[PDB]
Design an enzyme around this catalytic site. Sequence first.
Site, PDB file in Angstrom:
ATOM      1  CG  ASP A   5      16.319 -28.919  44.884  1.00  0.00           C
ATOM      2  OD1 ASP A   5      16.923 -29.878  44.360  1.00  0.00           O
ATOM      3  OD2 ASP A   5      16.185 -27.810  44.325  1.00  0.00           O
ATOM      4  CB  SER A   6      11.064 -31.278  49.116  1.00  0.00           C
ATOM      5  OG  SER A   6      10.476 -31.468  50.385  1.00  0.00           O
TER       6      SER A   6
END
Lengths: 384, 1136, 48, 158, 64, 114, 87
Positions: free
Chosen positions: B767-768
Site C-alpha cells: 500500500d505504498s
Amino acid sequence: FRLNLSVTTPYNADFDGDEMNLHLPQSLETRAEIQELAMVPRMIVTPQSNRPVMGIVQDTLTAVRKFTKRDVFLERGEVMNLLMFLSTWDGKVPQPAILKPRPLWTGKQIFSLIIPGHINCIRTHSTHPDDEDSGPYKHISPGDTKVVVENGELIMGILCKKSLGTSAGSLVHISYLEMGHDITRLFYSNIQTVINNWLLIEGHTIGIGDSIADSKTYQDIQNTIKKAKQDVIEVIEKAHNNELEPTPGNTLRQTFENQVNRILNDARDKTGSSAQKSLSEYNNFKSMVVSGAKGSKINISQVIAVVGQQNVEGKRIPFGFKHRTLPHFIKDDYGPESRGFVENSYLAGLTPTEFFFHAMGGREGLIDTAVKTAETGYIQRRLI
Amino acid sequence: DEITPDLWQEACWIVISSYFDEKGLVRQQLDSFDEFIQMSVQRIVEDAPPIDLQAPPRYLLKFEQIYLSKPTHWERDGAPSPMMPNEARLRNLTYSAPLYVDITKTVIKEGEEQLQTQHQKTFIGKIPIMLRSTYCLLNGLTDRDLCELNECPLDPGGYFIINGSEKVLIAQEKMATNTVYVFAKKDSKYAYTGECRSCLENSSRPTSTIWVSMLARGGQGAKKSAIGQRIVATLPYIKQEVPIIIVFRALGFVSDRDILEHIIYDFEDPEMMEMVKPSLDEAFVIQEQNVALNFIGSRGAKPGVTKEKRIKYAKEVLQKEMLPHVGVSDFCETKKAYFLGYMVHRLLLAALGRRELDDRDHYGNKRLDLAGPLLAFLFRGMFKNLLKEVRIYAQKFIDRGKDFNLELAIKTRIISDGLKYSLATGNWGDQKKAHQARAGVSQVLNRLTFASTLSHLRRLNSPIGRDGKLAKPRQLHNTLWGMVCPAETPEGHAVGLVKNLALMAYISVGSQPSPILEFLEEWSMENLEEISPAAIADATKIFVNGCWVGIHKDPEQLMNTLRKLRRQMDIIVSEVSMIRDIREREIRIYTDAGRICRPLLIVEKQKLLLKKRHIDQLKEREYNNYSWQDLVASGVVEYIDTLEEETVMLAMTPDDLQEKEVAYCSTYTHCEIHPSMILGVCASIIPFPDHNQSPRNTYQSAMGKQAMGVYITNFHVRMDTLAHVLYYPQKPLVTTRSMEYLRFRELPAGINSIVAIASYTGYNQEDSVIMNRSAVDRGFFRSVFYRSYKEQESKKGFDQEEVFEKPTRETCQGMRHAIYDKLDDDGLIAPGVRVSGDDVIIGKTVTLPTKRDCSTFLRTSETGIVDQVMVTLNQEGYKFCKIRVRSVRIPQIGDKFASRHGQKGTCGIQYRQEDMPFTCEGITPDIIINPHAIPSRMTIGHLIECLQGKVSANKGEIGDATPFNDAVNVQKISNLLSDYGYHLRGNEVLYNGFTGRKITSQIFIGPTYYQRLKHMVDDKIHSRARGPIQILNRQPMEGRSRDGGLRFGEMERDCQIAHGAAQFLRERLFEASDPYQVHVCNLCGIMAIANTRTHTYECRGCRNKTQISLVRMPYACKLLFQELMSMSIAPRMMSV
Amino acid sequence: SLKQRLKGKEGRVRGNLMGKRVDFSARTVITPDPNLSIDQVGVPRSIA
Amino acid sequence: LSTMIGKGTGAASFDEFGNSKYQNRRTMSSSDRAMMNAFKEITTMADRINLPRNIVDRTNNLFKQVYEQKSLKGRANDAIASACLYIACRQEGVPRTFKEICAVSRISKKEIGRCFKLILKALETSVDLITTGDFMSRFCSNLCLPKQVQMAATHIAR
Amino acid sequence: MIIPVRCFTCGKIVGNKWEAYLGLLQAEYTEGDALDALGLKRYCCRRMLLAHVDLIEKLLNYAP
Amino acid sequence: VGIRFCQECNNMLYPKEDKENRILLYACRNCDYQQEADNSCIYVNKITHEVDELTQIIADVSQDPTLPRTEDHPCQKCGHKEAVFFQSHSARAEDAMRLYYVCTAPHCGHRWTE
Amino acid sequence: SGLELYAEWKKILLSPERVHEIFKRISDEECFVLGMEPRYARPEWMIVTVLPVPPLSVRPAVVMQGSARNQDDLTHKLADIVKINNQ
DNA sequence: GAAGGGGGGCTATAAAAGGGGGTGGGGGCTCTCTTCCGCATCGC
Ligand SMILES: [Mg+2]
Ligand SMILES: [Zn+2]
Ligand SMILES: [Zn+2]
Ligand SMILES: [Zn+2]
Ligand SMILES: [Zn+2]
C-alpha cells in the site's frame, strides 16, 4: 522510518499510514541484550509454531514465481546486472545453462546463487497436480511444479509462497535451521534485491484485461447461475407444496435453507472454477494467486464470475421489513435475489439491491474487526 | 405523454436536479431550526401558565407574543449593530438574535378595580441563530450579496457560531414515542415486555415510559405452573411492579367483563382468554377502584401517611404520569383504559405468537432529534427558570408591600447563557446536571473539505453509547434503504453507530394532528368513547401519533381518501405518514418530527404519474416558476417514511420493473427516482461504487472527509485553527451524477493523476506509492497548511493584568530559549515574516503579584510565514489577536494519498521524470501503485475509473461513473478507448526509465482521481530524548505537541519479558521514565526523612537515624506507596 | 479519590508502573525500503 | 474550596423515609456569600444594557476593593454594585448615565450617585470628566440615526 | 485555484491556454475539439484543461 | 373451554361441583352466584395447537400490494382466477412454508390451502 | 446500610467508636486466629482514628491559565474533612 | 384637548440633635461470587 518488506509480516505492518515506535537503548548492557536476543535475524523462526515468522512478500514473491519458471532466460548483460545485487556472490559467473546458439542463464541458475550454503529442500508449487506424483514423470515435472533444491542449487521447480513463505519446511526455514540467522538474513535481502531488479525488466501489473473472461466463459457462468435460479425455485415450490421432507435433526425451515444455500454455494463454486479455467498464463490476477503474494481463487471468482450470497450472522439477508428484505420485493420471497445472492461479478457491477445487501454483508466484517481488536486483547492480557 | 426508457435517464436526473435546486443538502437542519423559532418558542411561551402573585393585592403576568430581531452585536459603547457571521467568527462572538416577549401585567387590589399594563417587547435573552436560516442575516441574500459580506455562496449554513466556533447539532436518534413496542428478553424474569414511551403533545415535561410485562415461566410451583404467566405493569414513580388488573381497577373498571372488554375485543377467541386468567386471579383481592388506587399509592414515590393521601397520590400518577400522551385530564380514564388494554392486547399477541416481536433496529420505530426539537427541549427548561426567578423576585417585592419592576424581575442570562452553554460545550441539558446531560450533541463543524463539511451537517448519532458494544445496533438494517447511506460510517468503536443521511432523505419537521383528527371525525370514524367494546373486533383501530383515536369499518376507502388528500396537499401535509396494517386491522397516522422520509415516484396501474409534460416543465425550471414543489402538488411524487415503506410495493426503475415481462409483481405503488440516492454525500463521489467490495466504499467515505482541496471559497477571510488548501484542485475526469449536487466541481478535493499500476522498484509495496518528483516540482498535489493562533490579553484581579508586548529577558520572570526578536513593538509578529520552531509570535506578559512570560510559541515542527495578523476585541471586550501562519506542504515521502476506492497509501519514494517509466509518447505516470493492492481489496471500480478516465481525457468528455447505470459497461469503455489508438484494456508498453528497455509486461496506466489526505508525515514525526516530565508522576510528558515520550505499555512490557531482556525492560520502565531515590528505615519499611544538605536521615516513628537505606525505585512506585499510605495501608519496603 | 487513581488501565499501577512513557523514543510513519536489510531501519536525520 | 455531595443513586443513599441522608450544607462564608451575590447582581445589570464582560470584570474588581475597604458597609450592596458598575463604565471610556445605570438597577439614581462619591473617596481614585462625545454613539445608534447625523451631532455638541 | 503553468506529467506549458480554451468553448467547440485546436495531444495535457476548476474567478469576487 | 361471567356482578365464573347433586356448577367468587354447567369440560390444553390458520387469515389481505398474486389457483367458491398467496409466519408452529391463498375478488374473501 | 453498621438482636446504630472499643479488646492470640498479624494489622487500626494527609506531591496543584492554582481532588476533599471535623 | 409655559421640589454641602428603620451578619452491559430464606430431612 524505512523498513525492509520482509519484516512487515512479523510486525503486521503496512505502509498505508502505519506509525512504528523507535526505542534507543541507552547503555551497552541493554544494547548488548537487544543485539544478542532481539535482533530481527534471531527472530526469523518463531517458537509459537516452529516455523519462520517472515518470508518473501508482495513483489518479490510474485516476481520470484515468474523468475523461477522453466522458460525464463537471461542474457549476459541481464545476468551481470543481477549479480551486482547479490551481496554473497563469490564473483564467479556460472556457466550458462544454454551455451549455443546464444549464452543464456535460466532464472533457476541465478536463484541458485542466492540460495545459501548447500541446503537441500523438497517442496511443491501451488499448482502441482496431485496425480503427478503417481505418474511416469514424478522426477521430471511437466509443469515444473516440483521444487527440488539440492546442494544449495535449485535444480527444478517454481518457487512460490509454499517454498519461500512462512511455512514449516520452507526453503527459508531450512536456511535458518542449517546456515543460521546471519546467513539467512542475507538470504532474505538477496532475494529481494536481485528479483526486485529483475522485475524492472519483466514487470508486473494488474488491469481491466485481467478481470475479463472469454464470451464462452461468460455464457457458462450465466448458464450456471440460471440453472441455480431454477434449482432454488424448484426447492421453493417443494416447500410451498409441502413436498419437502425435513432432514433428520433439522426443522423444515432449516432444511429449506440448507438446500437453498447448498444450491447457491455449489453454483458459486461452479461459476468460480469456470472463471479460473478461462484465465490464461499471462493473467495477472492468477499470477498473484499462484505465487501466494495476494488474493485467492475466491477473489478471482468474485471479480469475474459472481460475488455470491451475502450473509448476516451466518444467514441470508433477513426480513428486516415485514416478511421481505426490501420494499422492492413481494412478501415471502425466498428466491436467491430477494435474500442477498449477488449474481453479478464486481466487473459487471452490482444491482441496487445487490449493492445494498452487499453493504449489509460488509458491515458485519467491519463490526467484527472492531470487536476482534478488543475481545482478543482482554484474553491476551489475562493469559499473560 | 409518457417517458420512454430512452429518455428516462435524462428525465430522472431532471427530477433530482429540481429537488436539490429547492431543498439543498442541509434542509433538515434549517427546517428544524425554523420550526423551533417560528412555532416552538411561541408555543413554549404561550403554554407557560400565567404567573400569579398573592401576598391583598394580586398580580398576574402573561407572556403574549414573541419577537426576534436580527443577530445584533453591541459595541463597548452600547451602540447596537447587525452581526455578520464573518465578524462573529473573527471576533469570537456568538451569532445570536435578541429575544423579546410581550408581557401583560394585571393587578387586582381588592378594591374592585383592575389595572392592566402591557410591557411590549420585553428583552428576555438571546437565541443563537442557525446560519442561512429564515432568521439569519444571510437569509434571502443573492450569491452576489453573500460575497460582499465575505461569505461563501456555496456555504450551506445549518450550523451555529458560538464564541466564534462553528457548531453543528448532530441528529440524535431515539426510539419513537407514543408507540407500543413488544420485546422479548431472554435472560430477564419477563417472557415479554411491552413498553410505550409516552410524551405530551409539543414535547412538554419529558417522556414517561410504562412497561407491561409478562412474567417468565421459569418459576416452578404447583400454583404458579398451573395458572400460567401473569402480567404486571411498571408505572412511573412506583418502586415495584403493579399487577395489570389492579391498574384497570384503579382506572374505574372493576367487573372482569369490563376489564376484559378493553383487553380482549373478541371473547369468541378462547386462547387469548386463558392468557389473562392468571392476571385476574392475582388481583382478585382488589375488587374496588379505591382499594386499587390505595394499592398503587402504597408503592408511590413518597410514603403516604394516610390512606386519603395514598389514594390521591395514586390518582395523580394515573391521571398524568401514566400514558400522558393518551390524556392528562380527569376524564381520560376511559381513553387510558383502552390504550392500556391495547398494550395488554399487544402483549398477548406476542405471547400467543400471533404478532411478531417489534424490532429495535427498524427505523420506523426511530426518531431523529434535530436542532429544533433539541433547542425546544432546552428552551422549555430555561423559560421555566426565567418564570421561576420572575416569581421569586416579584414575591420579595409584593411581600414588602411595594410594586415590582417587571424588567428588573427578568434575568436575561437564563436563556442567553443556557442556550449558549449547551451549544458551546455539547453537554446537553444543564451545566449543574451534566451527569445526566447527553454529550456530543454539538460538535465543531468539520472544515477539512467541503464534502466533510456537508457530511457533518447530515450526520446521525445512534442512541447506543459508543463505549458499549453490541453488534445489532451497529448492523446495517434493511430499513436504512434510501434513508441512511449504507457505506458512510466511521471505522472503530463507532462502526454502525454514526450514520449519514441518504442523498434525498428528508427528516419530517412535524405538524399538528388537529386537521387530521377533525377530518377523521367528519369522515365515518366512530369515536373511541362512543362505541361499545364489541364493535372493535371487526373494525380497524385508528392511531394518530400513537394515540388510539377511534375505529373505522371501511379502512380501504379511508386510506384512499387519506392518500388522495396528502397527494393534493388539501388537509394532510406531505410529511404525514399513513400506514395501514391490513393484517393487524390498524391504521397508523404520524405527524410528529424526527421521521426519516424520502421522495418516491407514484405508480398507478403500472404507470408512472410522472409524464413527459412534467419533465418538459422542469427542464425550464427557471423563467417558468415550475419547481420540485409542483411535482409534489401535482401528486406524481410523494414522501414516504420508513414505516410506510413496509406497505409500499416499490419499483427500482420504471424502464424495466413496470414493463410487461415475466410476471413478478403487477401491483407496484411507487418507483425510485434513481437507485443512486441510497448513497450519502461522501459515498456519492465514489465512481463505479457498485464495482467495489463494500468495505472499500466505507473506507473511501472516511478518506474523502480527509482529502485536501478548497474547503470553502472564502477561506482567505476565515482564520481557522487548521486549514488545508490544495494549490491546483481538479474536478474528477470520471464523475457521478450526484456530484453535481455536492458542489464537488466547485470545490474539488483532488487531482486527476496519470496512475500506473506496476511493480517498479519495490518502493510501492504494501500500500505504498511512488510519486513523480518532477510532477511534484510542478505543483502536483502541492498544498498550503494554514494554522491560526489566537491570544487574548485579559485583566482580572486586584493588580494582575496581561498585555501584548516584547518581554525583555531581564524585566520578565518567565523565559524560554526561543527567539523573541521577531515580535514587533506591540508584542505581535508582523505578516510576511518567516517563523520556525521555537519562535515567539505573540509577546504576552502577565504582571507578577516583575512579570511572568505567557508568550505564544510557534509549533516546533511548524515552519511557515505569518500570513495574517488580525487584532480586534473578542466577545468579552478584551484586546484579541489572531495570527495565521502559512506553510507550504510539498508532497514528501510518507504523505498519505488515496484514490476514491479505499486504496490509501503513503508515498514510498519520489522519482524524477527520467527515472520514471515512460510510454512511447513520453508520458510518465504521476503515481505508481502496486498491483498487489487490487486483488484482495477487489476495488474493480478503481480499474474502471482508470479506463474511463483515459477515454475521458482523450475524448474530451467528463466520464459518467454513476453506480447503477446499464448504459456504461467495461466493454463499452474498452471499445471507446480502442478508437483513440490505445489498447482496449488500458494497458500500454512502458519503457524502464533507468535503462530505456521495454518492460516485458504491459502496464495498466491511465488517469485516476487521487486526493492528498490531511495526514502528512511532518505532522507525525516525533522524537524524544530527555524531555520535560509531568508533575504528578515525574514521567515524560504526553503528546507530540508537548514533546512527550512514547508509551511503553503493558503489551510492550509483556513482549520484553518473552524476549528475556530484563535489563532493557528495566531501562524502559525505570531508567528512561522516572528514576528516583528514596531513603527507607531499616526497622520499618516506611520512607524516612532525608536531608542531604545536612547529611541527616531520620525515621520519625522509630526514633532512629543511624540505619537508613537508600532505595532506587521508580517515582511512580513512590507515589503508589504514598497513595497507599493515604488509605492507611503500610507498604513496608524490607531490604533484608 | 485514591481508589480511582490506582485502578484501571490508566491507573497508577497499570498506567504508570506496568507501563509508562519513556525518553529516547521516536515515532513516525513507515515506508518501504527494499534496499535495506531485514535487520536495518532507515531513520530520519531529525530523529537521529 | 469545597465539594458538593451528588444525588443519591441506590436505596442506601436515602433515609428511612425518602429524603436523602447526605444533603449539601451551606458552608460558604457570609462575606463570600454576600460578595458572590453582588457579582451575580453585577452581571445581571450588565446583561440588561449589553455591557461587555471586560466592564463586568472591572466592576467585580471595584466591588471587591470597596467591599474589603468597608467604608460603604452601611450602604446596600446593590447600590455599591450599581455605583461600581457606573465607575467601571467611566474608567473604560464608555460612560453610562446615572439614569441608564438606574434603569438596570433597583437602586435609585440618588443612591447610586451617593455611593459613587463614597467609592471614589474609599478607593482614592478619580474618573475623567464626561464629554458630549461620550454618549453620541449610543444615543444616536439607539435613535437609529445615520453616521452622518451622528457625526453632525458630535461636532455640534463639541 | 488558477490554471497550472505546466502540465504535471510532461511539463508542457498549459497556463497560456485556459483563456483560449474558454474562448473556443464559447465558439461552440466541443471540449475534445477545443483541446485539439490548442495542440494538447497527450491525454496528460488534455487532463490539465479538461479537469481544471478556475476558482480564482470566485476569489476575485471578494473585496481585497 | 368457554368463558362465562355471572349475570349479577359480571365477574369471572369459575367451575365448582355440588356434592348433594354431583353436577358441575359455575360459581362467582365475589358474588356467591351459581349457574348450571352445560359444557362439562373445565378446560382443554392443546399442546400441538394445530389451529387452522385459515381462521386467523383476514380476507382484507387481498388488498395488500406487496403480497404476490397468482392466476393459477382459481377461487373454489366464485372461480375468480386471481388469488393472493402468502405464508403463515406465525410463531409456535415450529415449521411454516406452506402457502395460504385468499381470493382477490371483492366481496369474496374465500381462503384456502393447497 | 451504606457506611453505617447496624446491630440487630433490638436494633442499634453500631458506631465506629463502639467497633473500635470491641476491637481494642481482642487478644493478640485471637487476632492471629482471625488471620491478622497483630504487629502488622490490628483489627482496631481498621477504624479510622487519625486520617493520614497525603504529601503535596501526591495531590499537587496544577498551574494553568495564569498564576491561579487549581487544587487536587484530594485537596478539595481534605477541605471538607477538615471543615466537618472542625465543626 | 395637545403643547408650551410657570412655579416649585430635588439634587449636594456642612453641622447638631435623638430615635426609628434599613441593612448586613450569626444562630436554632455481562458474568461470577456471596448471602439469605424456604424446605424437607432426620434426630432426640
Ligand atoms: Mg494501516
Ligand atoms: Zn522506621
Ligand atoms: Zn502533458
Ligand atoms: Zn358475581
Ligand atoms: Zn372468490
